[PDB]
Short mmCIF file of C-alpha atoms and ligand atoms in Angstrom, two decimals:
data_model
loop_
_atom_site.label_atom_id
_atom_site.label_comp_id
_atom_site.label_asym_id
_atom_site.label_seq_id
_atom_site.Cartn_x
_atom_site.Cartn_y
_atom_site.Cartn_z
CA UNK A 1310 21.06 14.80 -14.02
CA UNK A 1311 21.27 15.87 -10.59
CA UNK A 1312 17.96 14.44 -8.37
CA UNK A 1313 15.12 15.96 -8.02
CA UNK A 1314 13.69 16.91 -4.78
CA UNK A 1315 10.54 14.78 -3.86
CA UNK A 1316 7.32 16.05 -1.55
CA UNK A 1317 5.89 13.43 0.34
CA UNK A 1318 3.20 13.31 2.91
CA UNK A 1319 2.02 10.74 5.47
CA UNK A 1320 6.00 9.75 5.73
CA UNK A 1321 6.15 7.78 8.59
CA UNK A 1322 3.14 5.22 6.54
CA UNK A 1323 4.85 1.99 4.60
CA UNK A 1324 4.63 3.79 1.19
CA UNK A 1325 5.76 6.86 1.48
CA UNK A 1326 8.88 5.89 4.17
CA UNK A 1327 9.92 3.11 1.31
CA UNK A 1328 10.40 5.64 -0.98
CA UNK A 1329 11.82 8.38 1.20
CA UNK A 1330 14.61 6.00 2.03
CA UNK A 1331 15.30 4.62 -1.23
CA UNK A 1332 15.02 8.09 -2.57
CA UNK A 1333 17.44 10.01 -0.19
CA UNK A 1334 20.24 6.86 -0.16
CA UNK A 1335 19.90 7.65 -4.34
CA UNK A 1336 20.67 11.66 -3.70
CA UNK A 1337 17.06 12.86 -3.53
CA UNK A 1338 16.27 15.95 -1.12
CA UNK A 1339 13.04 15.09 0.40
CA UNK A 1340 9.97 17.25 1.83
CA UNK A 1341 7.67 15.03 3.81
CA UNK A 1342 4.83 15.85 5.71
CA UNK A 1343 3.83 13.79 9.05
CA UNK A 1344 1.28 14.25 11.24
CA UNK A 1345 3.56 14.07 14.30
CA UNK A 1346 7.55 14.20 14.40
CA UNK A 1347 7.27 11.41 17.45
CA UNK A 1348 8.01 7.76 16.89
CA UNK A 1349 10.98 5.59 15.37
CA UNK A 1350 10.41 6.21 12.12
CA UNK A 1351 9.41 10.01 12.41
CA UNK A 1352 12.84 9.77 14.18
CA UNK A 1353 14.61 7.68 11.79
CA UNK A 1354 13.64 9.56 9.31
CA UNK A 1355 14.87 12.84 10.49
CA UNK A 1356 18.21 11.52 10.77
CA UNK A 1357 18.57 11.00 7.47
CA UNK A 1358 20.28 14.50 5.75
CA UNK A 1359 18.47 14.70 2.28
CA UNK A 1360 15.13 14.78 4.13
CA UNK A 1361 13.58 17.70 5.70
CA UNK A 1362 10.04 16.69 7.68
CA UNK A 1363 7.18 19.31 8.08
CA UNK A 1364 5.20 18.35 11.04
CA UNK A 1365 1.39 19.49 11.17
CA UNK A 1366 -2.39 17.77 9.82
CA UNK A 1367 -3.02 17.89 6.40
CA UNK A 1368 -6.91 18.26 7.27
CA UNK A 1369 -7.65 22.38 6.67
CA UNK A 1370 -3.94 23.21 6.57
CA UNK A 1371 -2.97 24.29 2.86
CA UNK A 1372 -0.11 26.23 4.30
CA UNK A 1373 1.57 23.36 5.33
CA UNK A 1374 1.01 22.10 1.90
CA UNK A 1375 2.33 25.02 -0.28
CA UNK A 1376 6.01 24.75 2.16
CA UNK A 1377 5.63 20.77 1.54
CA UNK A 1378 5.73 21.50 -2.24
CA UNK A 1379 7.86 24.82 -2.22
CA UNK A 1380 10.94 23.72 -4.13
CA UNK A 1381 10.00 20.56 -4.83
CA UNK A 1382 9.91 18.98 -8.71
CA UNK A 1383 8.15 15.62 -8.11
CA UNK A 1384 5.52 14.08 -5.87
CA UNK A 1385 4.30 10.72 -4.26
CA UNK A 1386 1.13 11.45 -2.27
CA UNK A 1387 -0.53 8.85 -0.23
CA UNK A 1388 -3.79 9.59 1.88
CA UNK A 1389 -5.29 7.46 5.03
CA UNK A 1390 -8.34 8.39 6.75
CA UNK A 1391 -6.73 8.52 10.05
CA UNK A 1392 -5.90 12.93 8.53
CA UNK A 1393 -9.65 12.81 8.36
CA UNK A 1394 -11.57 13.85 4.77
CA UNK A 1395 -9.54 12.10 2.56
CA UNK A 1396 -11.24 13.62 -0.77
CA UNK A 1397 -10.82 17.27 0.56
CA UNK A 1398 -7.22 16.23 1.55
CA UNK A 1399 -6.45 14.75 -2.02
CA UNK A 1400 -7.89 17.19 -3.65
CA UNK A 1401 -5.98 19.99 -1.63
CA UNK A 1402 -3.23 18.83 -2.14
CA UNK A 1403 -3.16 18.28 -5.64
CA UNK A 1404 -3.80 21.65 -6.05
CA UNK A 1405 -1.46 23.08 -3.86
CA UNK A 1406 0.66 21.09 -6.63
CA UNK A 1407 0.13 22.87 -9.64
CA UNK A 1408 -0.29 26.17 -7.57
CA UNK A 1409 3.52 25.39 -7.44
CA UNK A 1410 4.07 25.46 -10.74
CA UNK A 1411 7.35 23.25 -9.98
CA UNK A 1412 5.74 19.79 -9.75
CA UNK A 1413 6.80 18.15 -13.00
CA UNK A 1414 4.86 14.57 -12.33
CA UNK A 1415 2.39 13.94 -9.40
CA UNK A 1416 2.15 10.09 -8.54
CA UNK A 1417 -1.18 9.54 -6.39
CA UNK A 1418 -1.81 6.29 -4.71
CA UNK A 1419 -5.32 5.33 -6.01
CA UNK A 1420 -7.75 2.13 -5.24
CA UNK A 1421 -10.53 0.58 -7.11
CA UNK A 1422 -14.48 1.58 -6.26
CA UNK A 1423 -15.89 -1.73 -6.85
CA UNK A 1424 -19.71 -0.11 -7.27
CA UNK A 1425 -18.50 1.23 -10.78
CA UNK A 1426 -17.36 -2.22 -11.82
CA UNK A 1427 -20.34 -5.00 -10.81
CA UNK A 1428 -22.82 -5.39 -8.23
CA UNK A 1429 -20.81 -4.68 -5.47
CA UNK A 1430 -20.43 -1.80 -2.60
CA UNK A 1431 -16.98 0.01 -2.54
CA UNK A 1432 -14.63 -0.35 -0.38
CA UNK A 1433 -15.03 2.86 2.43
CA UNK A 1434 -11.11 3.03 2.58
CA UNK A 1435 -10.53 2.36 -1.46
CA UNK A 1436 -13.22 4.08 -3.16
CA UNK A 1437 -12.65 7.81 -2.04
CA UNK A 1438 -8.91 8.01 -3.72
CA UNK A 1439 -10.92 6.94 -7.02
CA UNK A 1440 -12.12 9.94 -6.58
CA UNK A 1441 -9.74 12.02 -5.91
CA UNK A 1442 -7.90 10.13 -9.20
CA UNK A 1443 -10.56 11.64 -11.52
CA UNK A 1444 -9.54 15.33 -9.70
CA UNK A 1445 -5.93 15.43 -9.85
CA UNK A 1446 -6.27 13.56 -13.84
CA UNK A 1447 -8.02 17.00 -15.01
CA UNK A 1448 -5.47 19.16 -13.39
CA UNK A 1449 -2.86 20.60 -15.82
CA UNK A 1450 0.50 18.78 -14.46
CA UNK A 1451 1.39 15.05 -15.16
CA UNK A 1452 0.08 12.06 -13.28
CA UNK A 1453 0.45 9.04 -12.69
CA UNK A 1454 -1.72 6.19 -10.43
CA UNK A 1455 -0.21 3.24 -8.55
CA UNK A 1456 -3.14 0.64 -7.02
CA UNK A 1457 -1.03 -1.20 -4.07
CA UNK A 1458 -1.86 -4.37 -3.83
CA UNK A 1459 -2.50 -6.35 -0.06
CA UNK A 1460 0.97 -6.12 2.08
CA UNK A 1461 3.04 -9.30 2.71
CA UNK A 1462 3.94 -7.35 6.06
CA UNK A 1463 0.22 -6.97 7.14
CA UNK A 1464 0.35 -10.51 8.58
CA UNK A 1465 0.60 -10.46 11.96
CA UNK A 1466 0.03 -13.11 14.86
CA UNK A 1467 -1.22 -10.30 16.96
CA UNK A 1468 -5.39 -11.02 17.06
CA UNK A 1469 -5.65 -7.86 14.44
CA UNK A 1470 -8.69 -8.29 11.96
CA UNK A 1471 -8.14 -10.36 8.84
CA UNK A 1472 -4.54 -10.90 8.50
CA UNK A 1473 -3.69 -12.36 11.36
CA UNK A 1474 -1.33 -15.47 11.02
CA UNK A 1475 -2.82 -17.27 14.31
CA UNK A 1476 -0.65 -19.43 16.43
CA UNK A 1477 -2.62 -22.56 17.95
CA UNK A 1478 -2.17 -24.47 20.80
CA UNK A 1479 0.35 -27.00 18.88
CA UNK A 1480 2.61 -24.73 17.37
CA UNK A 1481 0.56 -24.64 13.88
CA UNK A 1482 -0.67 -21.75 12.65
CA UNK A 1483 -3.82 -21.03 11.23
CA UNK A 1484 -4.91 -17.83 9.06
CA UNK A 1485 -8.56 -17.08 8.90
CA UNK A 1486 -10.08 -14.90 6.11
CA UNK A 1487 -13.30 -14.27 3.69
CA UNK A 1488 -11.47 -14.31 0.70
CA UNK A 1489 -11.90 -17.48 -1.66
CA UNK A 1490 -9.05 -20.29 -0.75
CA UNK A 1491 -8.25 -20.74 -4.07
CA UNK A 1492 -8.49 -17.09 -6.18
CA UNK A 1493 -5.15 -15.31 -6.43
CA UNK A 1494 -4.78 -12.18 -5.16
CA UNK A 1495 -2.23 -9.47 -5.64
CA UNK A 1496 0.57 -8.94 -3.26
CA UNK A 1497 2.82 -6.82 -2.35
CA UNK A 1498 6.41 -6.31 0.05
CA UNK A 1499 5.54 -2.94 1.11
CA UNK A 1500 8.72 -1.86 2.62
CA UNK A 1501 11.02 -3.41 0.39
CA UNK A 1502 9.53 -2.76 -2.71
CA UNK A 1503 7.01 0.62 -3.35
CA UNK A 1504 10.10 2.76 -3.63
CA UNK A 1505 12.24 1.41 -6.04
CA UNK A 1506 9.35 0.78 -7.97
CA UNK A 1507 7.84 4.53 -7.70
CA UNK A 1508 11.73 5.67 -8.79
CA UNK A 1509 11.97 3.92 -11.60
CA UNK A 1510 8.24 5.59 -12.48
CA UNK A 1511 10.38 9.02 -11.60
CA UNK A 1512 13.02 8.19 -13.67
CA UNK A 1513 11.07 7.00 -16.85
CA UNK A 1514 8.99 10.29 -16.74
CA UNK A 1515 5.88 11.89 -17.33
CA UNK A 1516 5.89 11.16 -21.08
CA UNK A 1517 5.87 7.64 -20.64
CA UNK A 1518 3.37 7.49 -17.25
CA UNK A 1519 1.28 10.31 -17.46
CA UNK A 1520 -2.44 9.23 -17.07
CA UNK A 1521 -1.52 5.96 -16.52
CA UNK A 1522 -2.78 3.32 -13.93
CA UNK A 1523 -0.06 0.90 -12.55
CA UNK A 1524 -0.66 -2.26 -10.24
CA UNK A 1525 1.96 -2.06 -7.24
CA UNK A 1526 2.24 -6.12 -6.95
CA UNK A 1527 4.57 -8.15 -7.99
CA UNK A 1528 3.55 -11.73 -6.88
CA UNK A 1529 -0.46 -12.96 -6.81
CA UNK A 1530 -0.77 -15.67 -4.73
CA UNK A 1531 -4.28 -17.17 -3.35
CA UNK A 1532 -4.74 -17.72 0.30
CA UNK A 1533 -3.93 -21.48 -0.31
CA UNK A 1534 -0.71 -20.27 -1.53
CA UNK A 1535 -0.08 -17.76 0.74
CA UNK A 1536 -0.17 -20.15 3.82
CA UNK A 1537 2.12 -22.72 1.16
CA UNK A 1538 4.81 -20.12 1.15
CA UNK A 1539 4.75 -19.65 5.14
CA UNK A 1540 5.07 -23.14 5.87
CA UNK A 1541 8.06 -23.72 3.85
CA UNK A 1542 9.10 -20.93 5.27
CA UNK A 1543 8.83 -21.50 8.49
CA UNK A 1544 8.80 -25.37 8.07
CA UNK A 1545 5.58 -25.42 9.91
CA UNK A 1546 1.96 -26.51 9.28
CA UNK A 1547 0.26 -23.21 8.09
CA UNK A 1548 -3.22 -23.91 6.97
CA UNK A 1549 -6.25 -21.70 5.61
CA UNK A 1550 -9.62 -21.33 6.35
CA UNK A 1551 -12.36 -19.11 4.78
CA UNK A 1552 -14.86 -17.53 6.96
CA UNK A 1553 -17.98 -16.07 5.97
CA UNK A 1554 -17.26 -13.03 8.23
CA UNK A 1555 -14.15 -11.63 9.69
CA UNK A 1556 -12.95 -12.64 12.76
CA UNK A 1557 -12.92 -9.30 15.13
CA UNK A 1558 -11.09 -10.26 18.43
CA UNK A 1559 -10.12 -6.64 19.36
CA UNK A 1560 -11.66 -3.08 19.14
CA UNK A 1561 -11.19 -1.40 16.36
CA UNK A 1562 -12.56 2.60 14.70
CA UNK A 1563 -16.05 2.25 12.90
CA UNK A 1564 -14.17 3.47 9.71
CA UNK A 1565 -12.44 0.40 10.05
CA UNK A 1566 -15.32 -2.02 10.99
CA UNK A 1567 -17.57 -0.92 8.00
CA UNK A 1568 -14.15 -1.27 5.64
CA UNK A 1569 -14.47 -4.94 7.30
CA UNK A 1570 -18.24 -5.72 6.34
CA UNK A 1571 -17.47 -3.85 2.95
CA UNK A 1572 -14.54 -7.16 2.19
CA UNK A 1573 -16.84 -9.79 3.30
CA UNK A 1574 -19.54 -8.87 1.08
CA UNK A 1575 -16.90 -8.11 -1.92
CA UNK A 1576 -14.73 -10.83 -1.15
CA UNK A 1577 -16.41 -13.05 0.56
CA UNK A 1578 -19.74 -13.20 -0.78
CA UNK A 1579 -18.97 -11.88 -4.53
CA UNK A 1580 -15.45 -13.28 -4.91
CA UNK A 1581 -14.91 -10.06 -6.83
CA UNK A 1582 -11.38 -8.89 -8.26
CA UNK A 1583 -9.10 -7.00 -5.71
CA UNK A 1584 -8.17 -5.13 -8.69
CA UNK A 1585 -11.85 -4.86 -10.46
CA UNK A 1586 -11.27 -2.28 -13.05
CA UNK A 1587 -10.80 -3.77 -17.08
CA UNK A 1588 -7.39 -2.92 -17.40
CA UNK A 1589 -6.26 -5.32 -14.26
CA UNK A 1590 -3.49 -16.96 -31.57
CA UNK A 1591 0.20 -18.20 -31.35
CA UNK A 1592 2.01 -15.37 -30.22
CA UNK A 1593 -0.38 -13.43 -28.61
CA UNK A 1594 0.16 -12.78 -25.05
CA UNK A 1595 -1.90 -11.07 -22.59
CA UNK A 1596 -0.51 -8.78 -19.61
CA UNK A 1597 -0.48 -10.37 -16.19
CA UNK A 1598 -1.05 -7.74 -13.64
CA UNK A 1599 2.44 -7.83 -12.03
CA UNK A 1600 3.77 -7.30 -15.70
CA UNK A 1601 4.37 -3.52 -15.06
CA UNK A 1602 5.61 -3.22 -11.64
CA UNK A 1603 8.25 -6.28 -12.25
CA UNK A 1604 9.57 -4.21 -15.66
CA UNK A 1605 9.57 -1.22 -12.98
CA UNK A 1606 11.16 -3.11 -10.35
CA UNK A 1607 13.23 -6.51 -10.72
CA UNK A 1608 14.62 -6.63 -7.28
CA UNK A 1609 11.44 -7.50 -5.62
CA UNK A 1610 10.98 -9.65 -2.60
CA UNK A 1611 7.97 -12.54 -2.61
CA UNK A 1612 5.70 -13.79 0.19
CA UNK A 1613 8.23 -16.95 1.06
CA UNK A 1614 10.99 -14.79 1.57
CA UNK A 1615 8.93 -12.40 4.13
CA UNK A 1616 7.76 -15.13 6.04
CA UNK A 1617 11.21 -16.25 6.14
CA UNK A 1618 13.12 -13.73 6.74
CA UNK A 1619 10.79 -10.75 8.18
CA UNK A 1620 8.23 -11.87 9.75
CA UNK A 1621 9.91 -13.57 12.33
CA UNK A 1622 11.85 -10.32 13.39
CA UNK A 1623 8.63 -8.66 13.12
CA UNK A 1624 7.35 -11.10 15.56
CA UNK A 1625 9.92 -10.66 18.17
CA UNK A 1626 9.59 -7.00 17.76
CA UNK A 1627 5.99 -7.35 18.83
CA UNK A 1628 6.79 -9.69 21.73
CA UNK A 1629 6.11 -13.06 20.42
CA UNK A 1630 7.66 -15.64 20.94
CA UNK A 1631 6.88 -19.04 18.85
CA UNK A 1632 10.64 -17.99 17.07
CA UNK A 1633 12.23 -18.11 19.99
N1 NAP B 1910 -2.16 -2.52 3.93
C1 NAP B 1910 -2.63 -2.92 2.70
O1 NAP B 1910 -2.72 -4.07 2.43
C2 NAP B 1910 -3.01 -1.81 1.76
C3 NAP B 1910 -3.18 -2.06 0.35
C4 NAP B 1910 -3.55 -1.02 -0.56
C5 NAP B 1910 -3.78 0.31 -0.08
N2 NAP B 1910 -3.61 0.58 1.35
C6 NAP B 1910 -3.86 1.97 1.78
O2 NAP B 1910 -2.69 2.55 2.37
C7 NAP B 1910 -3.10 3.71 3.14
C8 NAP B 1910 -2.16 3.76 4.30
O3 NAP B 1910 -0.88 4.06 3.85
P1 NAP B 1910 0.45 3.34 4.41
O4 NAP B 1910 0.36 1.88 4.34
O5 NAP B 1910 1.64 3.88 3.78
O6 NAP B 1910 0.42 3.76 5.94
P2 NAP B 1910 0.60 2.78 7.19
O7 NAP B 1910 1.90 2.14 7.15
O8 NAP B 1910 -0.55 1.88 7.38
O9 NAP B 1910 0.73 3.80 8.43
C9 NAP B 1910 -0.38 4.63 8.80
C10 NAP B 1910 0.09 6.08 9.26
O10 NAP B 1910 -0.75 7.18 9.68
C11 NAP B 1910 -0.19 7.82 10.83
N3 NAP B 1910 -1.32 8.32 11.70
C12 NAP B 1910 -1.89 7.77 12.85
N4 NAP B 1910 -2.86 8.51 13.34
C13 NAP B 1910 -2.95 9.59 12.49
C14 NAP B 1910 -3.79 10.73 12.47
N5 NAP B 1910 -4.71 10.93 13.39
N6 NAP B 1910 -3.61 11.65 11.46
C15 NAP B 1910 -2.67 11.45 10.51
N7 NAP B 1910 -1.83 10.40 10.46
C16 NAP B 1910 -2.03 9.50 11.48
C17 NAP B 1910 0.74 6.84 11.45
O11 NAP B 1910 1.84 7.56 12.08
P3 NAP B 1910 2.44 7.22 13.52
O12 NAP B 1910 2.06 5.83 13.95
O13 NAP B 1910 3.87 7.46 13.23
O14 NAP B 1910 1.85 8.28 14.36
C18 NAP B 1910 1.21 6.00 10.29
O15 NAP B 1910 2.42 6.50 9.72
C19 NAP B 1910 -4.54 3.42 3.49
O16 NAP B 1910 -5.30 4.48 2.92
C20 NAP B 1910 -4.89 2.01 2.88
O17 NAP B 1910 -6.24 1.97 2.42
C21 NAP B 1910 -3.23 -0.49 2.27
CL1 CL B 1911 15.27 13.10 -10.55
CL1 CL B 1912 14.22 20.72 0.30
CL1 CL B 1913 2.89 10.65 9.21
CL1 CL B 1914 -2.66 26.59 -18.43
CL1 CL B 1915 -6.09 -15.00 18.78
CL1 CL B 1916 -4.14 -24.36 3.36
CL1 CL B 1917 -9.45 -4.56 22.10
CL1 CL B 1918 -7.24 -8.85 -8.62
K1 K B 1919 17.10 15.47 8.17
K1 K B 1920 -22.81 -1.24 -9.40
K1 K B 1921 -3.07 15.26 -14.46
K1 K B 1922 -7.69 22.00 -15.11
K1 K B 1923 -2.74 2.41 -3.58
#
């Protein structure tokens, strides 16, 4: 079975540079889009031999999109509205897909619309890849859906809106958020773990995946439990606090800002699920939501073991300096 070569877009973004460098140390070729071929992992990733980067936006550029997929057998695509119309974008390139005719299963990262599940407003940045989910499901090639859940590595102590791990005064840190202290949410080790877990999706098939949704986490943790895991970490005093609205200490893109207001009033004010839709006697036993991504992916790293043994590097690399 020799491997497959993989199109990829937004490559230098968490996702899609997990896989590519799982992927290409496994014997995958690799076509991956990026919006610029500037910056360490742009550059990191061009030195790696089984990966070939096609530099150009995504936004009214379906050329670039029929090279990215010339060749190419299988697909992880993963949108940000930073390329600008993410719904046009999805939907572009799924078709550039099938025009293909090579692309033998299509992985999408998808999010929940919380509107379609309670009273609740979706989520600016999650809802539109629902939608382009329902497009690329009634296009004629396989598919498959992985929901990502929050990133262990989007803790920062950098004042960044609500994951920042904030260091006081006393050498405690403090982490401020809208989300109940005591409801679990899912996680997930970004780096480490999307692309083992999207191979193994690869390498099972489209028989077995096709139309299916699958949770990226593989730990849920609540915020209570979060800041647990850094302190032992860290062997510091890490405490919570929930906060009707999130703390904004720098500027930041309205995009962004009305993403903000859209978690306080899902999170914060409903305490609705991250992961709203259905699917997320002796004997009986009902599936956890890190079932499927664990039987995908046993090598996965939890939240103690980041703040252990990442975030500190992560840290320095920013310039802080409560490590040293
Ligand atoms: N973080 C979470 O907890 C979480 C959970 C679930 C889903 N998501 C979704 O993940 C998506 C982001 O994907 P990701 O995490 O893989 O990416 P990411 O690591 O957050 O990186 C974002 C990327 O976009 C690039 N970029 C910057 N300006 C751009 C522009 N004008 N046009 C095009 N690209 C531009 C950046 O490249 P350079 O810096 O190299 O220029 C960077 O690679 C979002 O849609 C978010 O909603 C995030
Ligand atoms: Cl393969
Ligand atoms: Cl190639
Ligand atoms: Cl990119
Ligand atoms: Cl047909
Ligand atoms: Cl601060
Ligand atoms: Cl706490
Ligand atoms: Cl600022
Ligand atoms: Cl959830
Ligand atoms: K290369
Ligand atoms: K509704
Ligand atoms: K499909
Ligand atoms: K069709
Ligand atoms: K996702």
């Amino acid at each position: 079975q020799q491997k497959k070569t993989i199109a990829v877009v937004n490559a230098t973004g968490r996702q899609a540079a997990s896989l590519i460098r799982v992927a290409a140390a496994v014997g995958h070729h690799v076509r991956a889009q990026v919006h610029s071929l500037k910056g360490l992992i742009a550059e990191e990733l061009q030195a790696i031999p089984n990966v070939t980067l096609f530099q150009g936006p995504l936004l009214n550029n379906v050329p670039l999109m029929d090279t990215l997929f010339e060749g190419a057998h299988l697909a992880f695509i993963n949108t940000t509205s930073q390329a600008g119309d993410e719904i046009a974008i999805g939907k572009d390139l799924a078709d550039a897909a099938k025009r293909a005719g090579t692309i033998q299963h299509y992985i999408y990262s998808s999010m929940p619309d919380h509107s379609l599940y309670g009273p609740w407003p979706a989520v600016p940045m999650w809802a539109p890849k629902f939608t382009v989910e329902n497009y690329v499901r009634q296009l004629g090639l396989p598919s498959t859906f992985v929901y990502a859940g929050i990133y262990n590595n989007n803790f920062t102590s950098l004042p960044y809106p609500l994951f920042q791990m904030e260091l006081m005064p006393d050498g405690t840190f403090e982490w401020h958020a809208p989300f109940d202290p005591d409801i679990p949410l899912p996680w997930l080790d970004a780096e480490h773990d999307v692309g083992p877990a999207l191979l193994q999706i690869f390498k099972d098939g489209p028989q077995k995946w096709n139309g299916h949704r699958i949770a990226l986490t593989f730990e849920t943790l609540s915020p209570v439990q979060v800041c647990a895991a850094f302190s032992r970490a860290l062997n510091r005093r890490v405490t919570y606090v929930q906060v009707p609205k999130v703390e904004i200490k720098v500027n930041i893109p309205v995009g962004y800002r009305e993403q903000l207001e859209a978690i306080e009033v899902v999170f914060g004010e409903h305490k609705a699920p991250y992961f709203p839709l259905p699917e997320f006697p002796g004997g009986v036993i009902s599936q956890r939501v890190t079932d499927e991504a664990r039987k995908l992916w046993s090598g996965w790293r939890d939240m103690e073991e980041y703040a252990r043994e990442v975030f500190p590097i992560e840290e320095e690399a920013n310039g802080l300096d409560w490590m040293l």
